[PDB]
UniProtKB/Swiss-Prot annotation:
Major localization listed first in the record, in broad terms: cytoplasm
Residues bound to ATP: V27, G28, S29, G30, A31, Y32, G33, S34, V35, K50
Designated gene of the protein: MAPK14
Any Gene Ontology CC annotation: mitochondrion
Active site residues per record: D165 (proton acceptor)
Modes of activity regulation: Activated by cell stresses such as DNA damage, heat shock, osmotic shock, anisomycin and sodium arsenite, as well as pro-inflammatory stimuli such as bacterial lipopolysaccharide (LPS) and interleukin-1. Activation occurs through dual phosphorylation of Thr-170 and Tyr-172 by either of two dual specificity kinases, MAP2K3/MKK3 or MAP2K6/MKK6, and potentially also MAP2K4/MKK4, as well as by TAB1-mediated autophosphorylation.
Protein name: Mitogen-activated protein kinase 14
Species assigned in the record: Homo sapiens
GO biological process: 3'-UTR-mediated mRNA stabilization; angiogenesis; apoptotic process; bone development; cartilage condensation; cell morphogenesis; cell surface receptor protein serine/threonine kinase signaling pathway; cell surface receptor signaling pathway
Effect of F317L: Emulation of the active state. Increase in activity
Function: Serine/threonine kinase which acts as an essential component of the MAP kinase signal transduction pathway. MAPK14 is one of the four p38 MAPKs which play an important role in the cascades of cellular responses evoked by extracellular stimuli such as pro-inflammatory cytokines or physical stress leading to direct activation of transcription factors. Accordingly, p38 MAPKs phosphorylate a broad range of proteins and it has been estimated that they may have approximately 200 to 300 substrates each.
Compartment(s) of residence: Cytoplasm; Nucleus
InterPro entries, sorted: Kinase-like_dom_sf, MAP_kinase, MAP_kinase_CS, MAPK14, MAPK_p38-like, Prot_kinase_dom, Protein_kinase_ATP_BS
Effect of Y66H: Lowered kinase activity
Protein backbone atom coordinates (compact mmCIF):
# COMPACT_ATOMS: atom_id res chain seq x y z
CA UNK A 1 0.00 0.00 0.00
CA UNK A 2 2.95 2.33 0.77
CA UNK A 3 4.29 4.39 -2.13
CA UNK A 4 8.05 5.04 -2.15
CA UNK A 5 9.06 8.46 -0.82
CA UNK A 6 12.06 10.60 -1.79
CA UNK A 7 13.80 13.55 -0.10
CA UNK A 8 14.81 16.98 -1.39
CA UNK A 9 15.64 20.35 0.19
CA UNK A 10 13.74 23.40 -1.10
CA UNK A 11 14.86 26.67 0.57
CA UNK A 12 16.05 25.28 3.95
CA UNK A 13 13.12 22.81 4.13
CA UNK A 14 13.21 19.03 3.69
CA UNK A 15 10.36 17.82 1.46
CA UNK A 16 9.58 14.11 1.52
CA UNK A 17 6.97 13.15 -1.09
CA UNK A 18 5.87 10.03 -3.02
CA UNK A 19 7.66 9.28 -6.31
CA UNK A 20 4.52 10.17 -8.24
CA UNK A 21 5.13 13.88 -7.60
CA UNK A 22 7.90 15.24 -9.79
CA UNK A 23 9.54 18.58 -10.61
CA UNK A 24 8.70 20.17 -7.27
CA UNK A 25 9.23 23.89 -7.64
CA UNK A 26 8.57 26.41 -4.81
CA UNK A 27 5.82 28.89 -5.57
CA UNK A 28 4.75 30.93 -2.50
CA UNK A 29 5.95 32.07 0.95
CA UNK A 30 2.79 31.10 2.91
CA UNK A 31 2.04 31.58 6.63
CA UNK A 32 0.67 28.09 7.43
CA UNK A 33 3.04 26.24 5.07
CA UNK A 34 5.21 26.32 1.97
CA UNK A 35 3.75 25.48 -1.43
CA UNK A 36 5.32 23.84 -4.47
CA UNK A 37 4.09 23.42 -7.99
CA UNK A 38 4.56 19.78 -8.98
CA UNK A 39 3.60 17.31 -11.68
CA UNK A 40 1.57 14.29 -10.60
CA UNK A 41 2.70 11.41 -12.80
CA UNK A 42 -0.30 9.20 -11.91
CA UNK A 43 -3.15 11.55 -12.84
CA UNK A 44 -1.19 13.62 -15.37
CA UNK A 45 -2.37 16.72 -13.49
CA UNK A 46 -0.32 19.77 -12.56
CA UNK A 47 -0.60 20.03 -8.79
CA UNK A 48 0.02 22.34 -5.85
CA UNK A 49 1.60 20.64 -2.82
CA UNK A 50 1.61 22.25 0.63
CA UNK A 51 3.80 21.19 3.57
CA UNK A 52 2.08 22.38 6.75
CA UNK A 53 4.67 23.88 9.09
CA UNK A 54 4.47 23.41 12.89
CA UNK A 55 1.08 21.65 12.58
CA UNK A 56 0.97 20.27 16.14
CA UNK A 57 2.97 22.83 18.13
CA UNK A 58 0.10 23.75 20.49
CA UNK A 59 -3.51 22.74 21.21
CA UNK A 60 -4.70 25.73 19.13
CA UNK A 61 -2.55 24.90 16.07
CA UNK A 62 -3.27 21.14 16.29
CA UNK A 63 -7.03 21.82 16.32
CA UNK A 64 -6.56 24.26 13.41
CA UNK A 65 -4.66 21.61 11.43
CA UNK A 66 -7.43 19.07 12.15
CA UNK A 67 -10.14 21.56 11.12
CA UNK A 68 -8.21 22.48 7.96
CA UNK A 69 -7.90 18.82 6.96
CA UNK A 70 -11.59 18.13 7.77
CA UNK A 71 -12.81 21.05 5.63
CA UNK A 72 -10.60 20.05 2.70
CA UNK A 73 -11.39 16.34 2.97
CA UNK A 74 -15.07 17.28 2.87
CA UNK A 75 -15.05 19.91 0.09
CA UNK A 76 -15.84 17.98 -3.11
CA UNK A 77 -16.99 20.59 -5.63
CA UNK A 78 -15.67 22.08 -8.88
CA UNK A 79 -15.64 25.69 -7.60
CA UNK A 80 -14.18 24.93 -4.16
CA UNK A 81 -10.57 23.92 -3.52
CA UNK A 82 -10.55 20.29 -2.44
CA UNK A 83 -7.99 17.59 -1.87
CA UNK A 84 -6.52 15.38 -4.61
CA UNK A 85 -4.24 13.80 -1.99
CA UNK A 86 -2.96 14.06 1.58
CA UNK A 87 0.04 12.11 2.87
CA UNK A 88 2.75 11.73 5.49
CA UNK A 89 6.15 10.03 5.18
CA UNK A 90 5.50 8.65 8.69
CA UNK A 91 4.89 4.91 8.97
CA UNK A 92 3.20 5.18 12.39
CA UNK A 93 1.50 7.61 14.82
CA UNK A 94 4.61 7.91 17.04
CA UNK A 95 6.70 9.31 14.18
CA UNK A 96 3.78 11.28 12.65
CA UNK A 97 4.79 14.97 12.46
CA UNK A 98 4.18 16.25 8.95
CA UNK A 99 1.09 16.75 6.81
CA UNK A 100 1.32 17.36 3.07
CA UNK A 101 -1.66 18.48 1.02
CA UNK A 102 -2.13 18.10 -2.73
CA UNK A 103 -4.62 20.00 -4.93
CA UNK A 104 -5.10 21.33 -8.49
CA UNK A 105 -2.52 23.89 -9.59
CA UNK A 106 -4.25 27.21 -10.29
CA UNK A 107 -2.73 29.96 -12.45
CA UNK A 108 -3.56 33.15 -10.51
CA UNK A 109 -5.91 34.76 -8.00
CA UNK A 110 -8.74 37.07 -9.08
CA UNK A 111 -6.62 40.10 -8.12
CA UNK A 112 -4.06 39.15 -10.78
CA UNK A 113 -6.92 39.07 -13.27
CA UNK A 114 -8.92 42.24 -12.48
CA UNK A 115 -5.62 44.20 -12.38
CA UNK A 116 -4.34 42.93 -15.75
CA UNK A 117 -7.49 42.18 -17.78
CA UNK A 118 -10.43 44.29 -18.99
CA UNK A 119 -13.55 42.24 -18.18
CA UNK A 120 -16.59 41.93 -20.47
CA UNK A 121 -20.03 41.48 -18.89
CA UNK A 122 -19.82 37.86 -20.12
CA UNK A 123 -16.67 37.16 -18.08
CA UNK A 124 -18.22 38.78 -14.99
CA UNK A 125 -21.28 36.52 -15.38
CA UNK A 126 -19.15 33.36 -15.51
CA UNK A 127 -16.86 34.37 -12.62
CA UNK A 128 -19.66 35.47 -10.27
CA UNK A 129 -21.82 32.46 -11.22
CA UNK A 130 -18.88 30.23 -10.28
CA UNK A 131 -18.47 31.97 -6.93
CA UNK A 132 -22.20 31.57 -6.21
CA UNK A 133 -22.18 27.90 -7.25
CA UNK A 134 -19.30 27.28 -4.82
CA UNK A 135 -21.00 29.22 -2.02
CA UNK A 136 -24.31 27.38 -2.37
CA UNK A 137 -22.24 24.26 -1.74
CA UNK A 138 -20.24 25.74 1.18
CA UNK A 139 -23.36 27.18 2.87
CA UNK A 140 -25.32 23.93 2.44
CA UNK A 141 -22.65 22.32 4.64
CA UNK A 142 -23.28 24.99 7.32
CA UNK A 143 -19.92 26.63 6.74
CA UNK A 144 -19.44 30.37 6.48
CA UNK A 145 -16.34 31.55 4.59
CA UNK A 146 -16.28 34.91 6.48
CA UNK A 147 -13.44 36.33 4.37
CA UNK A 148 -14.35 36.15 0.69
CA UNK A 149 -12.18 38.45 -1.40
CA UNK A 150 -10.30 38.37 -4.75
CA UNK A 151 -7.08 36.93 -3.22
CA UNK A 152 -9.12 33.99 -1.88
CA UNK A 153 -10.29 33.18 -5.41
CA UNK A 154 -8.14 30.98 -7.62
CA UNK A 155 -8.59 31.20 -11.39
CA UNK A 156 -6.97 29.55 -14.38
CA UNK A 157 -6.73 30.41 -18.11
CA UNK A 158 -10.20 28.98 -18.93
CA UNK A 159 -11.59 31.39 -16.28
CA UNK A 160 -12.45 28.36 -14.14
CA UNK A 161 -12.64 29.53 -10.52
CA UNK A 162 -12.23 27.86 -7.13
CA UNK A 163 -12.93 29.24 -3.64
CA UNK A 164 -10.15 28.97 -1.05
CA UNK A 165 -8.95 29.78 2.51
CA UNK A 166 -11.86 29.96 4.98
CA UNK A 167 -3.49 44.78 13.10
CA UNK A 168 -4.33 42.84 9.90
CA UNK A 169 -7.72 44.66 9.71
CA UNK A 170 -6.34 48.19 10.14
CA UNK A 171 -6.00 51.01 7.60
CA UNK A 172 -6.25 51.26 3.80
CA UNK A 173 -5.98 47.50 3.24
CA UNK A 174 -7.82 45.05 0.96
CA UNK A 175 -8.30 42.74 3.97
CA UNK A 176 -11.40 44.72 5.03
CA UNK A 177 -12.93 46.23 1.86
CA UNK A 178 -15.10 43.13 1.31
CA UNK A 179 -16.35 42.48 4.89
CA UNK A 180 -20.04 42.90 5.67
CA UNK A 181 -20.72 45.84 8.05
CA UNK A 182 -22.28 43.55 10.69
CA UNK A 183 -19.19 41.32 10.80
CA UNK A 184 -16.75 44.26 10.57
CA UNK A 185 -18.41 46.14 13.43
CA UNK A 186 -19.76 43.14 15.39
CA UNK A 187 -23.36 44.32 15.27
CA UNK A 188 -24.86 40.91 16.00
CA UNK A 189 -24.43 37.14 15.74
CA UNK A 190 -23.76 37.07 11.98
CA UNK A 191 -24.96 34.42 9.51
CA UNK A 192 -23.79 32.98 6.16
CA UNK A 193 -25.13 35.96 4.15
CA UNK A 194 -21.97 37.87 5.12
CA UNK A 195 -20.39 36.06 2.15
CA UNK A 196 -23.10 37.40 -0.18
CA UNK A 197 -22.07 40.95 0.76
CA UNK A 198 -18.49 40.01 -0.20
CA UNK A 199 -19.68 38.69 -3.58
CA UNK A 200 -21.47 42.03 -4.12
CA UNK A 201 -18.24 43.98 -3.52
CA UNK A 202 -16.27 41.62 -5.79
CA UNK A 203 -18.87 41.76 -8.57
CA UNK A 204 -18.86 45.58 -8.50
CA UNK A 205 -15.06 45.67 -8.67
CA UNK A 206 -15.13 43.37 -11.70
CA UNK A 207 -17.62 45.66 -13.50
CA UNK A 208 -16.09 49.04 -12.60
CA UNK A 209 -12.44 47.92 -12.32
CA UNK A 210 -12.09 49.70 -8.92
CA UNK A 211 -12.67 48.80 -5.26
CA UNK A 212 -16.28 49.50 -4.26
CA UNK A 213 -15.63 50.45 -0.60
CA UNK A 214 -11.92 51.30 -0.27
CA UNK A 215 -12.29 52.57 3.32
CA UNK A 216 -9.15 53.89 5.04
CA UNK A 217 -10.41 52.48 8.38
CA UNK A 218 -13.52 50.86 9.92
CA UNK A 219 -15.42 54.16 10.32
CA UNK A 220 -14.51 55.56 6.92
CA UNK A 221 -15.58 52.29 5.30
CA UNK A 222 -18.90 52.32 7.14
CA UNK A 223 -19.44 55.85 5.80
CA UNK A 224 -18.74 54.75 2.20
CA UNK A 225 -21.11 51.80 2.62
CA UNK A 226 -23.98 53.89 4.05
CA UNK A 227 -23.47 56.55 1.38
CA UNK A 228 -24.53 53.88 -1.13
CA UNK A 229 -26.98 51.65 0.77
CA UNK A 230 -28.42 54.23 3.19
CA UNK A 231 -28.42 54.35 6.97
CA UNK A 232 -30.23 51.55 8.91
CA UNK A 233 -34.01 51.72 9.36
CA UNK A 234 -35.88 51.19 12.63
CA UNK A 235 -36.25 47.46 11.96
CA UNK A 236 -32.53 46.80 11.36
CA UNK A 237 -31.65 48.86 14.47
CA UNK A 238 -33.69 46.45 16.64
CA UNK A 239 -31.59 43.53 15.38
CA UNK A 240 -28.27 45.22 16.22
CA UNK A 241 -27.82 43.66 19.67
CA UNK A 242 -24.62 45.63 20.34
CA UNK A 243 -25.69 48.66 22.41
CA UNK A 244 -22.33 50.34 21.67
CA UNK A 245 -22.80 49.90 17.91
CA UNK A 246 -26.49 50.92 17.86
CA UNK A 247 -25.80 54.11 19.83
CA UNK A 248 -23.05 55.09 17.37
CA UNK A 249 -25.19 54.48 14.26
CA UNK A 250 -27.98 56.76 15.55
CA UNK A 251 -25.41 59.58 15.84
CA UNK A 252 -25.00 59.66 12.04
CA UNK A 253 -27.08 61.89 9.77
CA UNK A 254 -29.63 59.62 8.12
CA UNK A 255 -29.25 58.98 4.40
CA UNK A 256 -31.34 57.34 1.70
CA UNK A 257 -30.23 54.37 -0.41
CA UNK A 258 -28.62 55.65 -3.63
CA UNK A 259 -29.97 54.71 -7.06
CA UNK A 260 -27.59 51.97 -8.26
CA UNK A 261 -28.35 52.65 -11.94
CA UNK A 262 -26.74 56.07 -11.41
CA UNK A 263 -23.64 54.69 -9.67
CA UNK A 264 -22.76 51.82 -12.03
CA UNK A 265 -23.41 53.69 -15.30
CA UNK A 266 -23.51 51.59 -18.48
CA UNK A 267 -23.77 48.25 -16.68
CA UNK A 268 -26.14 45.39 -17.53
CA UNK A 269 -29.46 46.35 -15.82
CA UNK A 270 -29.73 42.72 -14.62
CA UNK A 271 -26.29 43.06 -13.01
CA UNK A 272 -27.52 46.27 -11.37
CA UNK A 273 -30.61 44.46 -10.03
CA UNK A 274 -28.56 41.55 -8.63
CA UNK A 275 -26.15 43.99 -6.95
CA UNK A 276 -29.09 45.73 -5.25
CA UNK A 277 -30.29 42.41 -3.82
CA UNK A 278 -26.76 41.51 -2.65
CA UNK A 279 -25.72 44.83 -1.12
CA UNK A 280 -28.71 45.09 1.21
CA UNK A 281 -27.64 46.44 4.59
CA UNK A 282 -29.98 44.09 6.53
CA UNK A 283 -28.48 40.58 6.32
CA UNK A 284 -31.93 39.00 6.76
CA UNK A 285 -33.08 40.54 3.47
CA UNK A 286 -29.99 39.68 1.39
CA UNK A 287 -30.32 37.26 -1.52
CA UNK A 288 -28.88 33.81 -0.80
CA UNK A 289 -26.45 31.93 -3.06
CA UNK A 290 -29.14 29.35 -3.98
CA UNK A 291 -31.56 32.17 -4.84
CA UNK A 292 -28.89 34.19 -6.70
CA UNK A 293 -28.15 31.23 -9.00
CA UNK A 294 -31.74 31.50 -10.32
CA UNK A 295 -31.42 35.25 -11.10
CA UNK A 296 -31.98 36.08 -14.79
CA UNK A 297 -28.45 37.55 -14.95
CA UNK A 298 -27.12 33.96 -15.12
CA UNK A 299 -29.78 32.46 -17.45
CA UNK A 300 -26.95 31.55 -19.86
CA UNK A 301 -25.00 29.52 -17.25
CA UNK A 302 -27.75 28.49 -14.78
CA UNK A 303 -28.26 24.71 -14.61
CA UNK A 304 -30.59 23.61 -11.74
CA UNK A 305 -29.50 19.95 -12.13
CA UNK A 306 -25.79 20.89 -12.03
CA UNK A 307 -25.62 23.09 -8.93
CA UNK A 308 -25.10 20.40 -6.27
CA UNK A 309 -25.22 20.67 -2.48
CA UNK A 310 -22.91 19.14 0.16
CA UNK A 311 -22.90 15.96 2.26
CA UNK A 312 -23.54 16.39 6.02
CA UNK A 313 -20.57 18.18 7.58
CA UNK A 314 -20.05 16.88 11.12
CA UNK A 315 -18.71 20.02 12.79
CA UNK A 316 -19.29 18.94 16.41
CA UNK A 317 -15.52 18.68 17.01
CA UNK A 318 -15.44 22.49 17.50
CA UNK A 319 -16.97 22.18 21.01
CA UNK A 320 -14.29 19.66 22.00
CA UNK A 321 -11.45 20.55 24.37
CA UNK A 322 -8.75 17.95 23.73
CA UNK A 323 -4.99 17.56 24.32
CA UNK A 324 -2.30 17.98 21.63
CA UNK A 325 -1.82 14.20 21.21
CA UNK A 326 -5.59 13.66 20.83
CA UNK A 327 -6.05 16.24 18.05
CA UNK A 328 -2.92 14.86 16.36
CA UNK A 329 -4.31 11.30 16.60
CA UNK A 330 -7.62 12.46 15.09
CA UNK A 331 -5.60 14.18 12.35
CA UNK A 332 -3.64 10.99 11.67
CA UNK A 333 -6.96 9.14 11.40
CA UNK A 334 -8.15 11.56 8.69
CA UNK A 335 -4.82 11.21 6.85
CA UNK A 336 -4.91 7.39 6.62
CA UNK A 337 -8.68 7.33 5.96
CA UNK A 338 -8.36 9.55 2.87
CA UNK A 339 -9.77 8.12 -0.36
CA UNK A 340 -8.76 9.94 -3.59
CA UNK A 341 -11.36 11.18 -6.11
CA UNK A 342 -12.32 8.88 -9.02
C1 LIG B 1 0.46 30.09 -0.61
C2 LIG B 1 0.22 30.86 -1.89
O1 LIG B 1 1.42 30.79 -2.65
C3 LIG B 1 1.07 30.39 -3.92
N1 LIG B 1 1.70 31.04 -4.90
C4 LIG B 1 1.39 30.68 -6.14
N2 LIG B 1 2.07 31.38 -7.15
C5 LIG B 1 1.62 31.14 -8.51
C6 LIG B 1 0.74 32.29 -8.97
C7 LIG B 1 -0.42 32.43 -8.05
C8 LIG B 1 -0.45 33.45 -7.13
C9 LIG B 1 -1.52 33.58 -6.27
C10 LIG B 1 -2.56 32.68 -6.33
C11 LIG B 1 -2.54 31.65 -7.25
C12 LIG B 1 -1.47 31.53 -8.10
C13 LIG B 1 -3.65 30.67 -7.33
O2 LIG B 1 -4.75 31.08 -6.52
C14 LIG B 1 -4.38 31.68 -5.28
C15 LIG B 1 -5.65 32.09 -4.59
C16 LIG B 1 -3.69 30.70 -4.36
O3 LIG B 1 -3.61 32.87 -5.43
C17 LIG B 1 2.87 31.14 -9.35
O4 LIG B 1 3.83 31.87 -9.12
N3 LIG B 1 2.80 30.22 -10.36
C18 LIG B 1 3.88 30.06 -11.30
N4 LIG B 1 0.49 29.72 -6.41
C19 LIG B 1 -0.08 29.13 -5.35
N5 LIG B 1 -1.02 28.11 -5.63
C20 LIG B 1 -1.35 27.69 -6.88
N6 LIG B 1 -2.39 26.88 -6.87
C21 LIG B 1 -2.75 26.77 -5.55
C22 LIG B 1 -3.79 26.03 -5.00
C23 LIG B 1 -3.94 26.09 -3.63
C24 LIG B 1 -3.09 26.86 -2.86
C25 LIG B 1 -3.25 26.93 -1.39
O5 LIG B 1 -3.01 27.99 -0.83
N7 LIG B 1 -3.69 25.81 -0.71
C26 LIG B 1 -4.36 26.04 0.55
C27 LIG B 1 -5.17 24.88 1.08
C28 LIG B 1 -5.38 23.80 0.04
C29 LIG B 1 -4.08 23.47 -0.59
C30 LIG B 1 -3.71 22.16 -0.81
C31 LIG B 1 -2.50 21.89 -1.40
C32 LIG B 1 -1.66 22.91 -1.77
C33 LIG B 1 -2.03 24.22 -1.55
C34 LIG B 1 -3.24 24.49 -0.97
C35 LIG B 1 -2.05 27.60 -3.39
C36 LIG B 1 -1.91 27.53 -4.76
N8 LIG B 1 0.16 29.42 -4.07
Amino acid sequence: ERPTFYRQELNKTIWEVPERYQNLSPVGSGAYGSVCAAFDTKTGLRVAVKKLSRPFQSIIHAKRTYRELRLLKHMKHENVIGLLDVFTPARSLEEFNDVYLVTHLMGADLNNIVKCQKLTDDHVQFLIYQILRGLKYIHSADIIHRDLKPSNLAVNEDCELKILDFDEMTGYVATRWYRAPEIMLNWMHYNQTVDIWSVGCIMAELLTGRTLFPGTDHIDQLKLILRLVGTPGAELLKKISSESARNYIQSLTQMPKMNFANVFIGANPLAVDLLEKMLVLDSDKRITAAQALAHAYFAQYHDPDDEPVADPYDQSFESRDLLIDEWKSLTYDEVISFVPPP
